[PDB]
Amino acid sequence: MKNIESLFDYSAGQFEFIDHLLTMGVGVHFAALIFFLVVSQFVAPKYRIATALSCIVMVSAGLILNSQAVMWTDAYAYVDGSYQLQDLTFSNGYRYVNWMATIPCLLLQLLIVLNLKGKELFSTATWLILAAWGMIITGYVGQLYEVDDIAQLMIWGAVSTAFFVVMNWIVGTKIFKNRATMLGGTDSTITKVFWLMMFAWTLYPIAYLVPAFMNNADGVVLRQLLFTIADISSKVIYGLMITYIAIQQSAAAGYVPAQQAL
Numbered sequence: 001m002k003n004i005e006s007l008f009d010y011s012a013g014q015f016e017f018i019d020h021l022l023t024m025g026v027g028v029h030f031a032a033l034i035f036f037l038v039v040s041q042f043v044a045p046k047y048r049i050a051t052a053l054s055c056i057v058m059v060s061a062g063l064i065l066n067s068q069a070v071m072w073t074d075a076y077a078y079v080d081g082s083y084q085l086q087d088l089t090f091s092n093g094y095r096y097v098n099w100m101a102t103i104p105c106l107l108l109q110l111l112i113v114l115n116l117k118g119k120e121l122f123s124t125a126t127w128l129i130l131a132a133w134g135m136i137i138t139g140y141v142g143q144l145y146e147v148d149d150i151a152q153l154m155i156w157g158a159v160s161t162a163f164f165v166v167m168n169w170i171v172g173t174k175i176f177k178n179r180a181t182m183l184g185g186t187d188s189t190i191t192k193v194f195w196l197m198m199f200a201w202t203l204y205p206i207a208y209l210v211p212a213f214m215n216n217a218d219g220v221v222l223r224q225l226l227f228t229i230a231d232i233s234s235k236v237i238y239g240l241m242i243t244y245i246a247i248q249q250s251a252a253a254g255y256v257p258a259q260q261a262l
């Protein structure tokens with residue numbers, strides 16, 4: 001009731017497009033899961049946790065997308081030419097709770113391939129996860145108001161954006177100060193990962209603001225489209241680049257299965 005999805009009836013085309021976006025997302029993540037599983041054997045032990053974290057992200061995201069898909073079809077029924085709300089079973093909040101889990105995994109695998117270790121790894125990961133959780137929690141509270149109090153959505157979103165900016169400053173600083181440690185030419189690749197991250201993660205706050213500038217059924221569809229683009233880019237494409245960096249550094253470090261795989 002606190003999300004704009006509950007305010008509208010949906011045409012068959014809108015309803016089925018959203019359903020298909022979610023089910024396609026399930027398939028893409030679970031297909032990627034198998035890929036990350038199989039290639040982990042070609043990653044040196046020092047970096048293998050990075051590929052395992054991608055497996056965890058894939059199944060976490062895939063399970064939540066699958067839950068959303070079923071909740072979507074549970075909540076609406078085709079009545080008198082449109083899909084109409086029948087039950088209070090759909091909200092975007094499950095995405096937020098999930099981010100609490102997937103964002104730390106995405107950040108940790110970056111720090112691993114940057115060759116951080118020991119106290120700097122633990123300390124950097126701690127500040128980053130705290131900043132990320134602050135961002136997610138304040139965003140979560142904000143979107144509880146996307147129907148009733150747009151002013152409060154904006155203020156919680158400004159607080160959330162402050163955490164986001166500080167998080168990105170930490171990430172960028174560690175990347176640019178440590179890329180000279182990277183092997184196999186991946187000092188060039190990691191800079192592209194950072195820019196991919198900036199692009200993909202910024203799509204989420206744009207989706208968060210849809211209720212302010214497109215409060216109608218097509219805005220609901222656009223938000224799910226943006227989430228889909230952002231999810232694939234921030235989790236799947238990002239994970240593929242992290243895995244490439246892990247294998248390339250594994251090979252440059254003399255790990256034979258990595259060398260043969262490449």
Ligand SMILES: CCCCCCCC/C=C\CCCCCCCC(=O)OC[C@H](O)CO
Pocket residue numbers: 157158159161162165166168169171172173176177
């Ligand atoms: C809610 C309103 C708040 C509005 C606030 C607007 C400020 C945005 C400016 C920068 C964002 C920081 C993004 C992080 C970019 C990377 C920075 C970095 O990596 O620094 C390089 C380092 O200094 C070299 O070694």
Ligand SMILES: *C/C=C(C)/C=C/C=C(C)/C=C/C1=C(C)CCCC1(C)C
Pocket residue numbers: 099102103106135136138139140157160161164201202204205208230231234235
């Ligand atoms: C796979 C999911 C990812 C990488 C989620 C990332 C989410 C964000 C970067 C969220 C950012 C937000 C803001 C900066 C302000 C508005 C509220 C959020 C939480 C959507």
Ligand SMILES: CCCCCCCC/C=C\CCCCCCCC(=O)O
Pocket residue numbers: 045046047049108112121122125126129130
């Ligand atoms: C309040 C929340 C704080 C959460 C802090 C999280 C701490 C995570 C610390 C680092 C995890 C590293 C574990 C994997 C080791 C990889 C090193 C390697 O195998 O080469």
Ligand SMILES: CCCCCCCC/C=C\CCCCCCCC(=O)O
Pocket residue numbers: 130133134137138141
């Ligand atoms: C239970 C798991 C959550 C772990 C939280 C620990 C990390 C803390 C990070 C920043 C907290 C930001 C506080 C925002 C809460 C105010 C919203 C409200 O209470 O209405």
Ligand SMILES: [Br-]
Pocket residue numbers: 011012013014
């Ligand atoms: Br239609």
Ligand SMILES: [Br-]
Pocket residue numbers: 011013014
């Ligand atoms: Br239509």
Ligand SMILES: [Br-]
Pocket residue numbers: 044045046047
């Ligand atoms: Br190793």
Ligand SMILES: [Br-]
Pocket residue numbers: 060061064095098099102
């Ligand atoms: Br997720």
Ligand SMILES: [Br-]
Pocket residue numbers: none
């Ligand atoms: Br179905």
Ligand SMILES: [Br-]
Pocket residue numbers: 185186188189
């Ligand atoms: Br490259």
Ligand SMILES: [Br-]
Pocket residue numbers: 092143207208
């Ligand atoms: Br939201």
